Write a protein that binds this DNA or RNA. Structure first.
Ligand SMILES: [Zn+2]
Lengths: 36, 156, 177, 146, 94, 73
RNA sequence: CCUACUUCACAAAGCGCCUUCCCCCGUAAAUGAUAUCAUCUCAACUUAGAUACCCACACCCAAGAACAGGGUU
């Protein structure tokens, strides 16, 4: 999912800059996964 | 105040320290004495001189020609003392002035050889789609000088 | 002074060979020095029609250093005229194929865009290694000073240099590292 | 510092701490950069000043321990990044194209397949803008974008 | 003679022989030739500057397309220097 | 390079430069050592130029060339 | 490309026969700092990750519009 502004929606969601993009990675619900 | 030697502490152009004025005036006296003692004995060869005649400066060596774009109102063959000398150089020294060397130091003399017209110089104007088209021919007046002497006095 | 007419002219106009080491340097400071010397813009005899340009021998041009993400972000584009022959390669891929092409393309762009440009580009000799043919080493005259001052690493510092730099801070005694 | 020696017996031993050089020329500052008058006077080049502030595996030391200002910590952090990618700290490895002043990480930049028109060009960033406050020994300033 | 070089006016062949003899009159030993500068030496357009020396110091030097031409031309340059007829000689005082 | 001795005369209306000519030292000196297409390639690679300079040119172009041009100096 | 079949017939063809050789990058990992846990790292880092072809008169030709090319022992 590309979100131009990243939300968060659980504890486990965490923002990490990889490959030039901010991503929201999550482990409990991988549905949270986002991309700038 | 003290700064450790990093990349950008001391700027990359080299540090030169200006000498104190006492030994530097001693140095200047030594140099001027050398150059004047060359001039008194003729230790030079032939001279050139940058000379600010009609409106523009010429690098003038003795025995040569200079074409000047105006009529100088002098009869032909008539000697002239080109004042406004502003550099005089030899094989082993130069003397440049601020801006002009004194008249008491350098004499540059020339003659007027010939007093010609130039070639016909065409002045055409043209603007298109407008029937604008004009022609003129201008023959300018020119006088050719021959520079004889560049003599230098040892008055420094 | 006091030469004859033919040797005075021959001394004035005849061309000089300039070596130029290209290790660690960017290809545009090399290109700027070499372009000035290929045109003849380092001579007070310079005239555009005079054909007064000199010879330039740029060596070690495998060890060029673009100043930054240029090695991945600079693209060289060409188009073989066939439909679909548009080829863009980054500076890294172009450098891997032919390890001379980046300095040559930099120099080619710097030079004025007239018909002298390919006369000039033949006076230029680019070699990718330290190896230069012997028939060119016997012609060289000056080795031009490198345009980027190469900064040296931790391993190359002497002991006096390290001792001269102060330690700016006290670390706490109980610290893991 | 201390080290954790393991062999099975494991121990923690404090070993041979350095200490600051005696007289900071401008004491009673806050960060060690201030106390030696180096606020705007270094670059990515200088690997002594950068190498004092670095874990022996290339990582950089936290603010709360080394005592920097926030600004000079970010500056030294970016200068470490630009000194590692140029190949200036070879002793600090985690265990061949030549660069310097790389702002961004090398394997993660998409190339400029369409540099734009001149009035909206896509440029190549060079160096870091966190060093915008150094001394300018030039009239034409740092071109940070190429 | 204004602007005419000497050996446009006094045409000589074998200039080094005249120079060697002229140094024999001044009680000076034979001149040593020394290739001071050079360029393009293995190409079609060389440039050798050859200097004529007499006891560790040079009396003259001159350029040329080959070594022999530059050598004899340095000899002519020194011959202009010895006689006093250089290109910077004091102009004729009319 | 530059090795000159610069000075003012005492009043300060001229600048006197002393520049002698420096000779080359003896130590800094060496002793003297004692078809048509393929034609244009050989000449080009001899003289480091492109091929186009050696291709001939028309009678009309050769007929505008001035063969008694003015010399000087 | 023509051995067969087929149009055809000292050839040309398809409807017949033969040959056709390797990569695409976005993610998923391990070690690990700023931030002493952690973290794939627009931090230093470690994994999945081009050969071929070519190349010294005349007459006839499987070469050819002309020219060219090949052959004439
Ligand atoms: Zn501070």
């Amino acid at each position: 999912k590309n979100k131009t502004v990243l939300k968060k929606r659980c504890k486990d969601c965490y923002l990490v800059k990889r490959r030039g993009r901010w991503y929201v990675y999550c482990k409990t619900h991988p549905r949270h996964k986002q991309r700038q | 105040g003290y700064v450790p030697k990093t990349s950008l502490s001391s700027p990359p152009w080299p540090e030169v320290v200006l000498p104190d004025p006492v030994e530097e005036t001693r140095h200047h006296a030594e140099v001027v004495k050398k150059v004047n003692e060359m001039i008194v004995t003729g230790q030079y060869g032939r001279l050139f001189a940058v000379v600010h005649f009609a409106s523009r400066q010429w690098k003038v060596t003795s025995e040569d020609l200079i074409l000047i774009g105006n009529e100088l109102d002098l009869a032909c063959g008539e000697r002239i003392r080109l004042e406004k000398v502003l550099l005089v150089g030899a094989d082993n020294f130069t003397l440049l002035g601020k801006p002009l060397l004194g008249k008491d130091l350098v004499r540059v003399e020339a003659t007027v050889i010939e007093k010609t017209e130039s070639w016909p110089r065409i002045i055409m104007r043209f603007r298109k789609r407008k029937n604008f088209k004009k022609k003129r021919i201008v023959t300018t007046p020119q006088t050719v000088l021959r520079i004889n002497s560049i003599e230098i006095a040892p008055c420094l | 002074s006091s030469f004859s007419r033919a040797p005075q002219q021959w001394a004035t106009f005849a061309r000089i060979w300039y070596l130029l080491d290209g290790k660690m340097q960017p290809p545009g400071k090399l290109a700027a020095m070499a372009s000035i010397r290929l045109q003849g813009l380092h001579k007070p005899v310079y005239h555009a029609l005079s054909d007064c340009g000199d010879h330039v021998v740029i060596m070690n041009t495998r060890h060029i250093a673009f100043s930054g993400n240029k090695w991945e972000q600079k693209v060289y584009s060409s188009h073989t005229g066939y439909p679909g022959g548009f080829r863009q390669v980054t500076a890294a891929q172009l450098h891997l194929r032919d390890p001379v092409a980046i300095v040559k393309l930099a120099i080619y762009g710097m030079l004025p865009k007239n018909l002298h440009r390919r006369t000039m580009m033949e006076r230029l000799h680019l070699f990718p290694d330290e190896y230069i043919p012997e028939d060119i080493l016997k012609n060289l005259v000056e080795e031009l000073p490198q345009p980027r001052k190469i900064p040296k690493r931790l391993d190359e510092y002497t002991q006096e240099e390290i001792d001269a730099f102060p330690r700016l801070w006290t670390p706490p005694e109980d610290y893991r590292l | 510092f201390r080290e954790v020696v393991e062999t099975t017996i494991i121990e923690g031993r404090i070993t041979a701490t350095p200490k600051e050089s005696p007289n900071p020329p401008n004491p009673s500052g806050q960060c060690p950069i201030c106390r030696w008058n180096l606020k705007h006077k270094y670059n990515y080049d200088d690997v002594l000043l950068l190498s004092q502030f670095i874990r022996p595996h290339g990582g950089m030391l936290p603010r709360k321990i080394t005592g920097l200002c926030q600004e000079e910590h970010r500056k030294i952090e970016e200068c470490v990044k630009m000194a590692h990618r140029a190949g200036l700290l070879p002793n600090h490895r985690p265990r061949q194209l030549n660069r310097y002043l790389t702002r961004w990480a090398p394997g993660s930049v998409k190339p400029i397949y369409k540099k734009g028109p001149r009035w909206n060009r896509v440029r190549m960033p060079v160096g870091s803008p966190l060093l915008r406050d150094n001394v300018c020994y030039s009239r034409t300033p740092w071109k940070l974008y190429h | 003679m204004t602007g005419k070089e000497l050996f446009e006016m006094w045409k000589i062949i074998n200039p080094m022989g005249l120079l060697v003899e002229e140094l024999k009159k001044r009680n000076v030993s034979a001149p040593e030739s020394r290739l001071t500068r050079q360029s393009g030496g293995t190409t079609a357009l060389p440039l050798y500057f050859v200097g004529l020396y007499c006891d560790k110091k040079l009396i003259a030097e001159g350029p040329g397309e080959t070594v022999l031409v530059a050598e004899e031309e340095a000899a002519r340059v020194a011959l202009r220097k010895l006689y006093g007829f250089t290109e910077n000689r004091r102009p004729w005082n009319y | 390079n530059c090795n000159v001795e610069l000075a003012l005369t005492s009043d300060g209306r001229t600048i006197v430069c002393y520049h002698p000519s420096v000779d080359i030292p003896y130590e800094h000196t060496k002793p003297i050592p004692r078809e048509e297409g393929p034609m244009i390639e050989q000449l080009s690679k001899m003289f480091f130029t492109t091929k186009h300079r050696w291709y001939p040119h028309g009678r009309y172009h050769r007929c505008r060339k001035n063969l008694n041009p003015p010399k000087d100096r």
